[PDB]
Each structure stands twice: as C-alpha cells, then as structure tokens.
C-alpha cells in the first residue's frame, strides 16, 4: 500500500487558517481515493473530506462545508486540507487516508497531526 | 459527506471511484446501477 | 447475514415528523451494528445514524443532529429512525443496513424507502 | 458529521468494530492496545 506522511498541524486561535499536507510514496491521481478524517478526545473518528478518482468528485462533512477544501497536487504527490474559519470544535487529531479505486475501505493511513483551536 | 453539486442527468455516482461516471459505460454488462437504466434501456 | 425490510416512508410537509421502521430476521442487540443511510438523486450515499453493540453509543450526522433519533426494539427486532422538524434537504431514499460486530462493512441492506419533504 | 451526543470516558476508547465506548482494561493484555489506552495500561490496575 502507499505510505502517507502528514504535517501542518498546530495550535491556532478561532477564525484563523491552517493548511495540512499529506505526502504520498506514489501517485494517487488515477489510482487512489483520498480522504481527511479527524478524531476528537473521547469521540469517534469521522470523515472530513474525500477526493475521488482524477479529482472528479470532492465531498465534505456538513460541519466543515464551505470552510475546508481538500485538494491534490499529483506532481508533488501531496494531498492538502485547507482549513479556514477554524472553530473550537475543529480540535482533533487529523489523519489522511488512501484506498485503491477498486477497494471499498481505506487501508493506508498517516500518523495523524494535532490541530487545536482556542478562543 | 455530500458533493457541492450533483452528477449530471446521464451520469451516476460510482462509490468505488468516488466520482461521477457516465452511464454509457455500464449499459449492457450485467451488474448495472439502475439510475443508468433509463438511459441504458433507451438505447438500441 | 440478517434480512432487513423497511417501512414508514412517504411524503411529509416540512417541519413535521416521520418514523421509519426496519424489521430484521434475527436479533441484533448484541450481534450487529445498525445504521440508517440516505441518498439523493445525483448525490452520493451518506450515513445518517448509527447504533452500536448493545446500544452503548449512537452517532448522528451533523445535518440531522438534534432532529433524528435512532433506536432499537430487541423484543420486536426492529430498528427505528424518528425524524423530527424535517426539511426539504432530508428528501432522499433511506436505507437500513446492518453488519456483524466483527465485520467492518455493512453487509445487509433494506429495499430503501422514499422520503419526500414538501415545501 | 457522524458523531455521538456524548463522548467516551477518560479510561475508555472508542471501538470502531463494536462502534462503542469500551474500557481499555480489556484491550491492554497484548496485540493492538489502542494508543489512547496505552497510557492507562502502562500504569496497569
């Protein structure tokens, strides 16, 4: 499976922006569906954003709709999550994940990166 | 999760690829998603 | 593998309520995770509500939080989805799914039922 | 989206397979001690 490495997390104040990045060990544009997930303390891991084969379709969680943007640079082999209008409820460990286009489940995962949003 | 927009009329959302896909690609083959089958049955 | 048969849907004015039912062929309390999903025309299928082993944890999509409630009657072997303060955005085909507690993916599905919310 | 009204307690972890808050004391005797549980199970009892 493709390996993922995340970065960009930190502690910010509410309303600010933050860009997370996920470098992949191989190209995914036409081979892998990619996703950003997040897990808050004591909570379940939830899907934040998903970008599909050849970036035809992006989908977002309603709570992040309009504020987050998932994107992919195939030359840089890097997935991105741009987070604007950050709220305290965005505080979580954020993971990137990948799955072959012929696999139902995400089997590649980055180590995660901490995002904390204060007020 | 939901897309901002929606797949066009003669398309269908392929869950495996997570993408809008034209239904002309699955017309015939026996395993067709039904939202295609008007278009696909309206063929000849 | 359990068999699921749905009931309850239809057309309902905005702001009113509707209870969807899903009868199972066997008991699910200590055996299966249950879920309600929905899908709109041209849109992808998304999870709405999930109830876990022995009803310990219930999970809801942010769009329906505070409005929908998933529950399980083990004597009736029936999964319920109560839908209050319905909005036109809730218009979709609703499915009930179930999976054994040792399987990650939902493997049983109901026929689906149309829920249309009038304006 | 997809979240529960409440949240697991300090010495519990969310089991995705069961989809339920689960006490870590049951998941600290080999194998896959959930990372959130490793603290508690390094302090044992």
Residue numbers in the entry:
A (entry chain A), C (entry chain B): 1 to 119
B (entry chain C): 2 to 45
D (entry chain D): 1 to 45
Q: What is written in the article reporting this PDB entry?
A:
We co-developed ciltacabtagene autoleucel (cilta-cel), which hinges on a CAR guided by two BCMA-targeted nanobodies in tandem (referred to as nanobody tandem hereafter) to treat MM. Nanobodies, including VHH (variable region of the heavy chain of heavy chain only antibody) variants used in cilta-cel, are single immunoglobulin-fold antibodies of ~120 residues each. BCMA is preferentially expressed on mature B lymphocytes, and significantly elevated on multiple myeloma (MM) cells alongside soluble APRIL and BAFF in MM patients. We generated a panel of nanobodies against BCMA, and selected a couple with the highest affinities from the initial screen (Nb1 and Nb2) to arrange in tandem in the extracellular domain of the CAR used in cilta-cel.
The structure of the Nb1–BCMAECD complex was determined at 2.4-Å resolution, and the crystallographic asymmetric unit contained two copies of the complex arranged in a parallelogram shape, such that the membrane-proximal carboxyl (C)-termini of each component are on the opposite sides of the parallelogram plane. The two BCMAECD molecules are organized head-to-head, and the amino (N)-terminal moiety of each antigen polypeptide is embraced by two Nb1s burying a total solvent-accessible surface area of ~1,850 Å2 at the interfaces. The primary BCMAECD–Nb1 interface involves the complementarity-determining regions (CDRs) 2 and 3 of Nb1 and the β hairpin of BCMA, accounting for ~1080 Å2 in buried surface area. There is minimal contact between the two BCMAECD polypeptides (84 Å2), and limited interaction between the two Nb1 molecules (360 Å2) which seems mostly induced by BCMAECD. Likewise, the SEC results for the Nb1–BCMAECD complex hinted at a possible 2:2 stoichiometry. The Nb1–BCMAECD structure hence uncovered the assembly of BCMA-induced, Nb1-mediated dimer-of-dimers tetramerization, and the basis of the avidity-driven affinity increase measured using SPR. Of note, while the Nb2–BCMAECD complex was apparently 1:1 in SV-AUC (21.8 kDa), the Nb1 complex seemed to be 2:2 in stoichiometry (39.4 kDa), which corresponded well to our SPR results using monomeric BCMAECD-His and dimerized BCMAECD-Fc in relation to avidity and corroborated our crystallographic findings.
